[PDB]
Amino acid sequence: HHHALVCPAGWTLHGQRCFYSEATAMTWDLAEANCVNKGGHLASIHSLEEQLYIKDIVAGIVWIGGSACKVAGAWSWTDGTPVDYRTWCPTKPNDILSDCCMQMTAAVDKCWDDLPCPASHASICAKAAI
Structure with missing residues (x-):
């Protein structure tokens, strides 16, 4: 269609996507599985615009959809979208396989x-808007 987009109750709209703030703390793997049960993935982030929108939703450290747990330093998003934007903290990522899940930090x-x-x-999920 070409009409106004909506999000399911509990999710918020930015652009063509809907976001869910999961306040319950969990491991990265449980948070990704939780987002999949809810019809999406941990959020991928593709611009500073998205970074800033998500920053404004969340209340502290949050898991997002990046991991590099197969080949050291080779990041992927769980939703299959491109890693076409990065905003790693200074000197990061360490790219050590023991510590291979991506989060937005407390900065x-x-x-x-x-x-x-x-x-x-806590974590943030995303999926396409309706």
Whole structure:
């Protein structure tokens, strides 16, 4: 269609996507599985515009959809979209395979870092708008 977009209840609209703030802390793998049960993925981020929109939703560290757990330093988004934007914190990522899941950190700018996937954090999901 070519009419106004909506999001399901509980999700918020930015552009062509809907976002869900999951306040329950969980491992990266549980957070991704949670987003898949809800029809989406942990959020991928493709511009500073998206970075800033998501920054404004969330209340602290959040898991997002990046991981590099197969080949060290080879980042992918769980939703299959391109890694065409990055905003890693200074000196990051460390690209150590033990610490291979991506999060927005507690810095105000929500710069990204790669942490152990078992760390327990809130998260953000995304999926296409309706």
